[PDB]
Design a protein around this ligand. Structure first.
Ligand SMILES: C[C@]12CC[C@H]3[C@@H](CCC4=CC(=O)CC[C@@H]43)[C@@H]1CC[C@@H]2O
Lengths: 127, 127
C-alpha cells in the first residue's frame, strides 16, 4: 500500500497492539520501515533501524509474558500519522502490574512505521 | 521549572479543565510566546499568541463545547506528555463527540511550546 489514509492508520495501529499482545517481535519489526526510529519511553535515546528495534523488543516481549490492549480509539490524521492509548499488563517484582502508554506513529509512503514515540514513565505504572 | 513528569500531568489536566470551562484567555496564557499549535495534526502550524487566541475563540466561541479526559495523562521526563480526551459539541444540528489525543512539549518556564492535536473525522461520533 501507499501512505495510509486515516482509516488505514486506525487499522495498522490496532494491528500493532495485537502483535504486542501476542509477542510477535518479527511481525512488529516488519511493520517498521527498515530505517525507522523508536523512542520508548520518549525522552530516551532513539533506537535506530530494524536490527536494533528487534534486539530491543526481544529483551521485553520474549523474556517475560506480557499483554496489551487499546484503552480508547486510535486517533488518526490525514498525513499518515496517528496516536493511540493502551495498557500493558506484565509482571513486576513477581507481581502483576499495569502500564498506561500512548504511542504516536508516523507512517511512510509504503505504509510502514517511520517514527514511533511511546509516551510513558513510572507515573503511569500502577501495581 | 522544566516540568517534571508529575508536573506535566497536572499541567495537561489543568489545560483540559480550562478548555471545558472555556476560559480562552486562561488557555492562551499557558502558551509560550513562540508556541506552535497543530490542530488537527497535519494542518499548517499556528503561531503567535493572538492567532492562537483567535483559533481557540473560533473553536470555543460559546459554542457549548465540553471536554474531559478519557484516560490518564502520559508524561515523560523531558517536559512532554500526551493525553486522551473527548470533546462534546453540536455539529450538523447533531450532538457529537470527538475523540482526541493532544501531545505537548513544555519549556523551562512551564509554558506550552508545542501542541499537536491528533484527530480526524474517523474520531467523530453522534451521541
Ligand atoms: C473545534 C472543535 C471544538 C474544540 C476542539 C476541536 C478538536 C481539537 C481540540 C483540541 C484541543 O486541545 C482544544 C479543543 C479542540 C474540535 C473540532 C470541532 C469542534 O467544534
Amino acid at each position: 500500500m501507499n501512505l495510509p489514509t486515516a482509516q488505514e492508520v486506525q487499522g495498522l495501529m490496532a494491528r500493532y497492539i495485537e502483535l504486542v499482545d501476542v509477542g510477535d517481535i518479527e511481525a512488529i519489526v516488519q511493520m517498521y520501515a527498515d530505517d525507522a526510529t523508536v523512542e520508548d519511553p520518549f525522552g530516551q535515546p532513539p533506537i535506530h533501524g530494524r536490527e536494533q528495534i528487534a534486539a530491543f523488543y526481544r529483551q521485553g516481549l520474549g523474556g517475560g509474558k506480557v499483554r496489551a490492549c487499546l484503552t480508547g480509539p486510535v486517533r488518526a490524521s490525514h498525513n499518515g500519522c496517528g496516536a493511540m492509548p493502551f495498557r500493558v499488563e506484565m509482571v513486576w517484582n513477581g507481581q502483576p502490574c499495569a502500564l498506561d502508554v500512548i504511542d504516536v506513529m508516523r507512517f511512510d509512503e509504503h505504509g510502514r512505521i517511520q517514527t514511533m514515540q511511546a509516551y510513558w514513565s513510572e507515573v503511569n505504572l500502577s501495581v
